C-alpha cells in the first residue's frame, strides 16, 4: 500500500463528509449531488447508500467507500443484468441490436442520452460500422 492512492480517496471522501465525523449521510451525499446540478430525491439517496452500506447503519463509512470505488462494474451479475437490459429491446432474440434501434431506445427513453453521449456509445458499440451491435460483446467490453 502506498500513500499515492490513499491521498485521492481520502480527499474525495472529505468532500462528502463535510462535517468530518467519518461518515456520509443522505444529506451530505445529496448536497454534493445538488452542487453538481443534480436534483435527487431522498428515496434515491437512500437507495444509493443502501447499495454499499454493508453494516446497514444507513450511512457510508470510509471502508465501504473504498470498497465501492474498487468494485465499480465488476459485480459478477453486472454483465447479465446490463445484457438482459439490452435483450428488452432486441425484439428478435439474435443477441444483436441495430445501431439505429439502440440510438432510438437510448435517446427516447428515460434518463435520455445526450446526442453526443449516444454518438460516442454507438461508435464504441458498432465496431464494424454496419449498424449491428453484438450487445453481449459490447457489454463484455464495458464490464472490463
Amino acid at each position: 500500500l502506498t500513500e499515492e492512492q490513499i491521498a485521492e480517496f481520502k480527499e474525495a471522501f472529505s468532500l462528502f463528509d463535510k462535517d468530518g465525523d467519518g461518515t456520509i449521510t443522505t444529506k451530505e451525499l445529496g448536497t454534493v449531488m445538488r452542487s453538481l446540478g443534480q436534483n435527487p430525491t431522498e428515496a434515491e439517496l437512500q437507495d444509493m447508500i443502501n447499495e454499499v452500506d454493508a453494516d446497514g447503519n444507513g450511512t457510508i463509512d470510509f471502508p465501504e467507500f473504498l470498497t465501492m470505488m474498487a468494485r465499480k462494474m465488476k459485480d459478477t451479475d453486472s454483465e447479465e443484468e446490463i445484457r438482459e437490459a439490452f435483450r428488452v429491446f432486441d425484439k428478435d432474440g439474435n443477441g444483436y441490436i441495430s445501431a439505429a434501434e439502440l440510438r432510438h431506445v437510448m435517446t427516447n427513453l428515460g434518463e435520455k442520452l445526450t446526442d453526443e453521449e449516444v454518438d460516442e456509445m454507438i461508435r464504441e458499440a458498432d465496431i464494424d460500422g454496419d449498424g449491428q451491435v453484438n450487445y453481449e460483446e459490447f457489454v463484455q467490453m464495458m464490464t472490463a
Binding site: M73, V88, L109, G110, L113, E117
Partner: peptide, 19 residues
C-alpha cells in the same frame, strides 16, 4: 420493462465513460 432497462444501460455507459 423498458424504462428501467434504459436506465441501467444509460447508467452503465456514463460510468464506463468517466474514464
Amino acid at each position: 420493462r423498458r424504462m428501467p432497462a434504459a436506465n441501467l444501460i444509460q447508467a452503465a455507459w456514463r460510468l464506463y465513460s468517466t474514464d
